[PDB]
Amino acid sequence: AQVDEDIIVSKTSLWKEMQYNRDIIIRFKFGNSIVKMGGLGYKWSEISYKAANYQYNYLRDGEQVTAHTTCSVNGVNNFSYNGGFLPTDFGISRYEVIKENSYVYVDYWDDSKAFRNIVYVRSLAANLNSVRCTGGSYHFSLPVGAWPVINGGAVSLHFAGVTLSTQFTDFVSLNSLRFRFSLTVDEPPFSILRTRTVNLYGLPAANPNNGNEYYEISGRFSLISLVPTNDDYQTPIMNSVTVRQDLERQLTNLREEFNSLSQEIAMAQL
Amino acid sequence: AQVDEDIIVSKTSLWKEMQYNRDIIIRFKFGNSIVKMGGLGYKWSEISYKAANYQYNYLRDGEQVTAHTTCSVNGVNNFSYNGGFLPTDFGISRYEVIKENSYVYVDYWDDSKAFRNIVYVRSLAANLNSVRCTGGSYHFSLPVGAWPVINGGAVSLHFAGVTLSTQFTDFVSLNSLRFRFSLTVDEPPFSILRTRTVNLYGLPAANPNNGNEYYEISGRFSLISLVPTNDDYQTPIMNSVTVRQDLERQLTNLREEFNSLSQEIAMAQL
Amino acid sequence: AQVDEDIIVSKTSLWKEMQYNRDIIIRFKFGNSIVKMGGLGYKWSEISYKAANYQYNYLRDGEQVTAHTTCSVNGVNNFSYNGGFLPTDFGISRYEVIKENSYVYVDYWDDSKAFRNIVYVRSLAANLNSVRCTGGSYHFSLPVGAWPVINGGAVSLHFAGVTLSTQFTDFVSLNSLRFRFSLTVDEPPFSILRTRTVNLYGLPAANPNNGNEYYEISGRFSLISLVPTNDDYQTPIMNSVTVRQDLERQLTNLREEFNSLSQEIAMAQL
Incomplete structure (x- = not known):
C-alpha cells in the first residue's frame, strides 16, 4: 500500500466512490485581534482570538501542493486584568485565553486530487x-x-x-x-x-x-x-x-x- | 404513515431518493439593531431589524433533537418620527415596521436524518x-x-x-x-x-x-x-x-x- | 441547432448530463469605497474598488429572464498623491487603479434552466x-x-x-x-x-x-x-x-x- 494510494471503492455510469489516503502537513497560524480603548490610552478594551487563514504550499512525493489552512478557537476563557478605575493605571477590560476546557479547530484544504469535488465523505479518520x-x-x-x-x-x-x-x-x-x-x-x-x-x-x-x-x-x-x-x-x-x-x-x-x-x-x- | 416516517421512493447503486415527513417545532427570535445618533444624545439614527439566529433543542417522541433557526425580515416600512428640529428634543431618524406588505422569513434546520445531505428537494410542502x-x-x-x-x-x-x-x-x-x-x-x-x-x-x-x-x-x-x-x-x-x-x-x-x-x-x- | 439549445448527453435513472448552450448579456457595475480621513477635511484615506452586485432582467428570444451579476477586481495598483506634508493642502493617501497587469472578474447567474442545479461542470467555454x-x-x-x-x-x-x-x-x-x-x-x-x-x-x-x-x-x-x-x-x-x-x-x-x-x-x- 502506497503512502498516496488511490482506490475506486465503487463505480457507476455517472458516479464513483474514490478512496483517498494522503499524507499532509498542517501549517496554521493563530489570529489575534487587539483593540485599544480611547481616552489617555492606558485601557485595552479587548484582546480576543480571531479565525486566521494561512495559505502556503509544500512538497508531496515530488509534487508541489498548494494548501490553505484556517485556525479558529472554541470555548476560550475570558480573563481580565484590572488595577483601578482612574485613567492613570494600566488596564485590560477583557482578554481571551486558551485553556484545558477549550478546543482548537484547524481546517485544511489541499490542491491534490483528494479534494477536487469533496462533498460527501465516508469513514473520515486521520x-x-x-x-x-x-x-x-x-x-x-x-x-x-x-x-x-x-x-x-x-x-x-x-x-x-x-x-x-x-x-x-x-x-x-x-x-x-x-x-x-x-x-x-x-x-x-x-x-x-x-x-x-x-x-x-x-x-x-x-x-x-x-x-x-x-x-x-x-x-x-x-x-x-x-x-x-x-x-x-x-x-x-x-x-x-x-x-x-x-x-x-x-x-x-x-x-x-x-x-x-x-x-x-x-x-x-x- | 408515521409522524416521523422515513420512506423510500427510488434506490440506485450510489444514490437513493428518500421521502421525509417530520413534525417540527420552529422556535425563532427577532433581531434588532439600535444605533443611536451622536450629538447631544436626544437623537436615534436607526431602529432596524436583524436576521437573528437561535439554537435550541426539543424533545421528539422520546429523543432529543437539536435545531438551528434564523428569523429574518423582508419589505419593512421605514417610518420616521421627528420630535423637532432642535438638538435638545427626542427624535428618531428612521425605524423599521412590520405591516401587511412585508414578510417574515424563518429558516429551520435539525440534527435529524431529514437534513443529513439535503442538497436537492422537490414536492416540498408544509x-x-x-x-x-x-x-x-x-x-x-x-x-x-x-x-x-x-x-x-x-x-x-x-x-x-x-x-x-x-x-x-x-x-x-x-x-x-x-x-x-x-x-x-x-x-x-x-x-x-x-x-x-x-x-x-x-x-x-x-x-x-x-x-x-x-x-x-x-x-x-x-x-x-x-x-x-x-x-x-x-x-x-x-x-x-x-x-x-x-x-x-x-x-x-x-x-x-x-x-x-x-x-x-x-x-x-x- | 438554436441559440438556446438544450441537450441530454447521457441519461440515467436519477442523474443526467445536460449540455446547455445559451446567449447572455452581462450587465455589471463597478464598486468603489470612498473613505474620508478625519482632521480638517483636506485628506482622503483610501479610494479602493469593491465587489459590487447588480440585479436586472432582460428579454431573451421571447422570454424575460432575471439575472444577477457581481463585479470585482484583483491585483489593483495603489497610487499615492500628496500635495504636501502639511495638513491644510489637499491630499489623498491611496487610490486603487486598474492597469494592464490586473484583471476583472465578473460572476454571472440567471433564473434560466442553465443554473437550476449547477454544481459540477464540464468543458466550460464561452x-x-x-x-x-x-x-x-x-x-x-x-x-x-x-x-x-x-x-x-x-x-x-x-x-x-x-x-x-x-x-x-x-x-x-x-x-x-x-x-x-x-x-x-x-x-x-x-x-x-x-x-x-x-x-x-x-x-x-x-x-x-x-x-x-x-x-x-x-x-x-x-x-x-x-x-x-x-x-x-x-x-x-x-x-x-x-x-x-x-x-x-x-x-x-x-x-x-x-x-x-x-x-x-x-x-x-x-
Missing part, C-alpha cells in the same frame, strides 16, 4: 501528532510610564475528532477537513510585567504565534467520497462575497459622523 | 399554524427628561410558501428550510408614549420579542431528496468564516484614527 | 466580446477652496478564461460562472486638476461608471453539468447570512463609546 504552542511577548506601548509586557503561556495541542467543514473567505469557498485539538497546558506560566496576578497557565491571545510564521503538524487522513465519474470538472471553489451590507452601511454612517465630529474639533481648535 | 407577535416596551434613555417609551404593536404571522434556503453563521453552514410568513395587523397599535405620532399599526423593531424567550410555531413538512445510497455520509455543515477583510481593515483604521482623536481630546483636557 | 470602460469625474469635496476633481481613465476589457464561482450576498448564494477579463489601457489618461502629475494611464476607483447604469457585454457560454433527471429538484438558492458577529460586536462597542465621547464634547461646548 492520525496527527501533537504540537507545542508557546505564546510570545507583546508590549502594551503606553505614551508615558512603563511598557507592561504580557509573556509566557504554553499549550500542547493533542489530536481529537475529525469532520468535514467549509472555509469561506473573500477569495475562496473550500470544502475542507476540520481537525479539532484538545489541549494540555505545558509548564511555563503566563503573566504581565507590573501586574498583580501571576503563576497562571494557558496561552494569551496577545501574540500566540510567537515569532513563528506557522505551527506545523504532520498528519494523514483516509476518506472515501462521491466524485462523478470523469475528472474534467470545476466544482465552484473560487468565491465572491458582498455580505453584511447593513453592517457596511452603519459602518459608513459612523465614519461620516466621526469625520464631521473631528472636523468640528479642528475648526474649534483653530 | 402546514404551520399561525402565530402572534406583540411588541414590548423600550425606554429611550435620554440624558435629561422623562424617558419616552415605544410600546404597543402586534402582528400575526400567517403561513405562506415554503422553499429551500441556506443559513450562514460564523460557526456553521446549514442547508435549511425557509418558511415565508405573511402578516396581519392586530388590535394594539404601536406608538410612543408622551409623543405625537399615534394610532398607526404594525410592529416596531424596538422590542419585538417582548421578553419572550422565543416565538414557537408547531409545524410539519414533507420533502423528497436525493441522498447517497447509505446514510454513513456527511456533507460539510460546520463552518469557519473570514469574509469581509475589507470591512475588517476599514474598522481597524477607523479605530486607530478615533483612538488618536480621543487621545488628543483627553490630553488637551488635562 | 465567447464574450470586449468592452470599453471609461471612468467618470469625481469631485473631491474640500472644506474651502478650488474643489480638485479626478477625471479620465479608460480601459478595454478583453475576454480571458472562464470558470465557476459562487456569489454570496445578504439574500442569495448563487452558483455562477466567472468570466475573467484582461485589460488594455485606452488613450484618455486619468488626472486630478490643480495638480502636477500628468498623463498616467489606468482606471481610478474614484468613479469607474461615468454615470453609466452598467456595462453591457453580449455573451454566450456552453457547459455540460450533472442535474437530477426530475426537473422538479431545486438546490438552495436563497440565503440568510449572519457571518462576522465579531464585527457587529466591535462596531457596537466603538459606537457606544463614541457616543459617550460625543456627549462629552457636546456638553463641554454647551
Whole structure:
C-alpha cells in the first residue's frame, strides 16, 4: 500500500466512490485581534482570538501542493486584568485565553486530487501528532510610564475528532477537513510585567504565534467520497462575497459622523 | 404513515431518493439593531431589524433533537418620527415596521436524518399554524427628561410558501428550510408614549420579542431528496468564516484614527 | 441547432448530463469605497474598488429572464498623491487603479434552466466580446477652496478564461460562472486638476461608471453539468447570512463609546 494510494471503492455510469489516503502537513497560524480603548490610552478594551487563514504550499512525493489552512478557537476563557478605575493605571477590560476546557479547530484544504469535488465523505479518520504552542511577548506601548509586557503561556495541542467543514473567505469557498485539538497546558506560566496576578497557565491571545510564521503538524487522513465519474470538472471553489451590507452601511454612517465630529474639533481648535 | 416516517421512493447503486415527513417545532427570535445618533444624545439614527439566529433543542417522541433557526425580515416600512428640529428634543431618524406588505422569513434546520445531505428537494410542502407577535416596551434613555417609551404593536404571522434556503453563521453552514410568513395587523397599535405620532399599526423593531424567550410555531413538512445510497455520509455543515477583510481593515483604521482623536481630546483636557 | 439549445448527453435513472448552450448579456457595475480621513477635511484615506452586485432582467428570444451579476477586481495598483506634508493642502493617501497587469472578474447567474442545479461542470467555454470602460469625474469635496476633481481613465476589457464561482450576498448564494477579463489601457489618461502629475494611464476607483447604469457585454457560454433527471429538484438558492458577529460586536462597542465621547464634547461646548 502506497503512502498516496488511490482506490475506486465503487463505480457507476455517472458516479464513483474514490478512496483517498494522503499524507499532509498542517501549517496554521493563530489570529489575534487587539483593540485599544480611547481616552489617555492606558485601557485595552479587548484582546480576543480571531479565525486566521494561512495559505502556503509544500512538497508531496515530488509534487508541489498548494494548501490553505484556517485556525479558529472554541470555548476560550475570558480573563481580565484590572488595577483601578482612574485613567492613570494600566488596564485590560477583557482578554481571551486558551485553556484545558477549550478546543482548537484547524481546517485544511489541499490542491491534490483528494479534494477536487469533496462533498460527501465516508469513514473520515486521520492520525496527527501533537504540537507545542508557546505564546510570545507583546508590549502594551503606553505614551508615558512603563511598557507592561504580557509573556509566557504554553499549550500542547493533542489530536481529537475529525469532520468535514467549509472555509469561506473573500477569495475562496473550500470544502475542507476540520481537525479539532484538545489541549494540555505545558509548564511555563503566563503573566504581565507590573501586574498583580501571576503563576497562571494557558496561552494569551496577545501574540500566540510567537515569532513563528506557522505551527506545523504532520498528519494523514483516509476518506472515501462521491466524485462523478470523469475528472474534467470545476466544482465552484473560487468565491465572491458582498455580505453584511447593513453592517457596511452603519459602518459608513459612523465614519461620516466621526469625520464631521473631528472636523468640528479642528475648526474649534483653530 | 408515521409522524416521523422515513420512506423510500427510488434506490440506485450510489444514490437513493428518500421521502421525509417530520413534525417540527420552529422556535425563532427577532433581531434588532439600535444605533443611536451622536450629538447631544436626544437623537436615534436607526431602529432596524436583524436576521437573528437561535439554537435550541426539543424533545421528539422520546429523543432529543437539536435545531438551528434564523428569523429574518423582508419589505419593512421605514417610518420616521421627528420630535423637532432642535438638538435638545427626542427624535428618531428612521425605524423599521412590520405591516401587511412585508414578510417574515424563518429558516429551520435539525440534527435529524431529514437534513443529513439535503442538497436537492422537490414536492416540498408544509402546514404551520399561525402565530402572534406583540411588541414590548423600550425606554429611550435620554440624558435629561422623562424617558419616552415605544410600546404597543402586534402582528400575526400567517403561513405562506415554503422553499429551500441556506443559513450562514460564523460557526456553521446549514442547508435549511425557509418558511415565508405573511402578516396581519392586530388590535394594539404601536406608538410612543408622551409623543405625537399615534394610532398607526404594525410592529416596531424596538422590542419585538417582548421578553419572550422565543416565538414557537408547531409545524410539519414533507420533502423528497436525493441522498447517497447509505446514510454513513456527511456533507460539510460546520463552518469557519473570514469574509469581509475589507470591512475588517476599514474598522481597524477607523479605530486607530478615533483612538488618536480621543487621545488628543483627553490630553488637551488635562 | 438554436441559440438556446438544450441537450441530454447521457441519461440515467436519477442523474443526467445536460449540455446547455445559451446567449447572455452581462450587465455589471463597478464598486468603489470612498473613505474620508478625519482632521480638517483636506485628506482622503483610501479610494479602493469593491465587489459590487447588480440585479436586472432582460428579454431573451421571447422570454424575460432575471439575472444577477457581481463585479470585482484583483491585483489593483495603489497610487499615492500628496500635495504636501502639511495638513491644510489637499491630499489623498491611496487610490486603487486598474492597469494592464490586473484583471476583472465578473460572476454571472440567471433564473434560466442553465443554473437550476449547477454544481459540477464540464468543458466550460464561452465567447464574450470586449468592452470599453471609461471612468467618470469625481469631485473631491474640500472644506474651502478650488474643489480638485479626478477625471479620465479608460480601459478595454478583453475576454480571458472562464470558470465557476459562487456569489454570496445578504439574500442569495448563487452558483455562477466567472468570466475573467484582461485589460488594455485606452488613450484618455486619468488626472486630478490643480495638480502636477500628468498623463498616467489606468482606471481610478474614484468613479469607474461615468454615470453609466452598467456595462453591457453580449455573451454566450456552453457547459455540460450533472442535474437530477426530475426537473422538479431545486438546490438552495436563497440565503440568510449572519457571518462576522465579531464585527457587529466591535462596531457596537466603538459606537457606544463614541457616543459617550460625543456627549462629552457636546456638553463641554454647551
